Subunit: 169 residues, 4 copies
Amino acid sequence: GQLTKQHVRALAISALAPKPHETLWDIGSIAIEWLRSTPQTTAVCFEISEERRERILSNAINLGVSDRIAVQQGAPRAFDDVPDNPDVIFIGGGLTAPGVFAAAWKRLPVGGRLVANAVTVESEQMLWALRKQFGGTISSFAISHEHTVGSFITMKPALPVHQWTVVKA
Amino acid sequence: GQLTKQHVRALAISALAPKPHETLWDIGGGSGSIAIEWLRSTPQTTAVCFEISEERRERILSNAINLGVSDRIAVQQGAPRAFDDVPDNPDVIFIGLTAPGVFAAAWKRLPVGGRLVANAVTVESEQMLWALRKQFGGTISSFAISHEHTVGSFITMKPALPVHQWTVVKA
Amino acid sequence: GQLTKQHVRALAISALAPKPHETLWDIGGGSGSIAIEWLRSTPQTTAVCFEISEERRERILSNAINLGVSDRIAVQQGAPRAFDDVPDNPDVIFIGGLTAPGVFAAAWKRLPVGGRLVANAVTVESEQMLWALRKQFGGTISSFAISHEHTVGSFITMKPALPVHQWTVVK
Amino acid sequence: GQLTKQHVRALAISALAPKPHETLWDISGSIAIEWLRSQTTAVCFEISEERRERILSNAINLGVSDRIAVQQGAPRAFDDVPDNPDVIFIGGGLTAPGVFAAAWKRLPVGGRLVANAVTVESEQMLWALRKQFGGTISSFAISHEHTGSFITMKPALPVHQWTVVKA
Ligand SMILES: [Ca+2]
Ligand SMILES: [Mg+2]
């Protein structure tokens, strides 16, 4: 269930290697989670859906971090709303969507870090382009979970995630 | 999903290692598919199938007829009560696999130096091959097979459930 | 390499689910990896370590210091024995030496109702044991195959590491 | 060792899915040979003199030798065989310059194609061909039992297999 989904998140925040001085731009899960495992780290979210937004700020509340997270609107023109530059960046997919990556590699100070997940054929095709241009590393995770069927258990193989992780030059 | 069907038999067929003058018992899950291709891929061979439904037997043998391998297949009923019909000792056995008593029964009929290839689809099934491997010798391999899968604007590579496959020679 | 050694730590931390006033027993392979992160990821926690080597205990605590986590870790010797000298019952346990004679039943007697243990297996022998302890105390098993680029010449391949099995449970 | 290589060929041959009296152009000798065993023929193209020497060696050892023709390197050698192939295998490098276009040219419509890709590069290329000409991409994650006092399951490298019929 949400199992699969927590195992992905753990891999994302690990890649990102939070320091406390630093501010995330998640492009409402990876942002919120970055707000519970490291103090003095703030997350900026960008979300084109009002409804999904009402949701990110909503759950921001459970873990008492709501006033660190800023839920913004959609890429990439939302960035101009945010004058304060980023240090670490998460794109959990949506790399294929134009003007978006370009726009954000720009808002990123050199020495600034990046992690991108890709779980489509097109998504992953992206990761290799960006990777082959700016460097960084690609690793991937094949995760399966235990599934019962009346009198039988099997190992449901989740979809694979590729993860780009780069430092900027 | 029918691509998984294709790819899995092949591996099964790779594994079985069909030669001149050999007989295959093809026992259990979807009895006939491996028999029919065993019969196809190789000249001068015999297959026996074990099928419960009077009418699932009436689709295995009908199909054989078509590929022209009706000559060399028999369709018996369900094992191991149907092993007691078939008199000659088989050369190779395939199980697609944990029914009460079907292994030991079928196995009391394989002669020294015979070969059997079994496939697991559940964990209960997987853990068994590990224990029949312990005594009986043999070697276990694994197959995750993925097929493109296009939801709307995006392909992913959707994984089938993995398949476990035990291939040993006896003695 | 050290990158599945990072990534495996991550999944084990997320699984252990650290909360306030909690005490981890971190037992077995590489005792300390999970502990100092467990400690260095959540204010207000104590972790317990069980290492056999006098020289390895000296380096775990060294690193707990160098992470300002010196004052919430005890570094004991090997279980199951070293359980007998640690007085307070653990809140969560993690095993990564998953099958030493005795460690588990021992580790286990010490765990309260509705307490949590997450274990790692990397071999089949370990893996089929999680499956047996799974069948007693409940809980759930998932598995991780992690790959990294491997540029053997002009051609990168994606290069799989050995899988890893993880049992997480509530007593 | 050669095991995982056995599973590999077992798969290609299925997707290749031979027909009686069909010609194959296999662009080490594995699949040409394999093609030839299970009245069909095979044309091997091989840059490698020392492997060339080797495939005829195997075709004889196994015994379909006057059914196999070990050619030289592609795509240059392509023009040599004036007789059109009915089915192509690329297990070889499909990113190798001019190799792919040059043989899709020799392939009649209704002719089939199995392509194997086992690198990041070769796989990314395998998607480019798929987009233009069609066909299907599947991938197989094969591991094997590997034993000190323990057994573990060594994951082989994954194969992306492209299979397509020509329109
Ligand atoms: Ca010469
Ligand atoms: Mg009737």
